[PDB]
Amino acid sequence: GSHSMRYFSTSVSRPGRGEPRFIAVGYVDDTQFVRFDSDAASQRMEPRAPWIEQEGPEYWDEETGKVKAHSQTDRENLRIALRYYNQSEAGSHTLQMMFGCDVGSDGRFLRGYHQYAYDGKDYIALKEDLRSWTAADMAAQITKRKWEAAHVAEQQRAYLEGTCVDGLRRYLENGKETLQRTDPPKTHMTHHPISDHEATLRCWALGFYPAEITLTWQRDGEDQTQDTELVETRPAGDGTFQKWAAVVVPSGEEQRYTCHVQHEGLPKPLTLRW
């Protein structure tokens, strides 16, 4: 199928507590592979997956160089943002950036991303045509204006549709054994009496990769949608993911319910019944 590469950054100003902390991370699909931490001692982009550990010293030099430049850039954008919002130079703020690309199952560009959030809400983002910007507010309109006069977007297009896809393609090869795997969910059901007349059925999905999954409960074939408790898909810590879905059921009606598991590692969706 398709694949993605994502870089995520966070810069957190620390007034009355230091100088702005910058953390960047790289993902391919749902597998992290580099980090950078401005407070860590190394001051180096480091490997986080086994399959990236096979790049030359000059990859690491170069990737360290770029991330460090980004950290100085968002350091200064933090200052500019304080201005644009007329905010005190004494409070802590958050500049978050994401960028990267998707590719289709043959390797071709699908989509490029470049976007910014300030204090957790949208700031400015590159629209899909890689040609225009979507600004969240008046403050981000100053930026949109600056960046259109300057043709910032056209100049990102070399990276988005070239470097980004090419690196993604090179990662999917050197990481084939781990990044083109599809690990289907190990499923089971639990069942706990809650009262004289009520029971919890919980549908478990374990050990799957990639993270995307869907679990829905039916009652006699009808989607049960509000009696259902659903957890955020979580990481096991070994590179796979977990999730569960639970319904509270009247005692003795357990057979009436079924749980349905769709994951791209499953030929046919699984239906589970206590």
């Binding site: 995520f8 966070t10 957190v12 953390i23 991370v25 993902y27 992290q32 980090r35 931490d37 986080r48 802590s92 958050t94 978050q96 994401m98 959030a117 204090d119 957790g120 809400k121 639990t190 706990h192 919980r202 957890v231 955020e232 979580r234 990481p235 096991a236 810590g237 070994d238 977990q242 569960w244």
Partner: protein, 100 residues
């Protein structure tokens, strides 16, 4: 700016069976700002040498971290995760329910 409260999940990497080594996981997600303290407790005492993931964030820019430690479930020991975020007027403690 709006802050968001963390969603806290505590769990083992594999189904618990007393005796065999495992990992204890505390997953905080969907929170903002990123400043957060997260601690794992064995019988109310803070486990030293806990590892955590590199700070990342979701589509909606909310943050998530995984905190974890090697451990071995025993029939008498209790486990919890203690999350300390600006949006919690007191630290939240979620006990380890071997089935969530």
């Amino acid at each position: 700016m709006i802050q968001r409260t963390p969603k806290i999940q505590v769990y083992s990497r594999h189904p618990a069976e007393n005796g065999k080594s495992n990992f204890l996981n505390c997953y905080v997600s969907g929170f903002h700002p990123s400043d957060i303290e997260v601690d794992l407790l064995k019988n109310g005492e803070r486990i030293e040498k806990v590892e955590h993931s590199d700070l990342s964030f979701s589509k909606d820019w909310s943050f998530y971290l995984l905190y974890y430690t090697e451990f071995t479930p025993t029939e008498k020991d209790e486990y919890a995760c203690r999350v300390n975020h600006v949006t919690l007027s007191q630290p939240k403690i979620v006990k380890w329910d071997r089935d969530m």
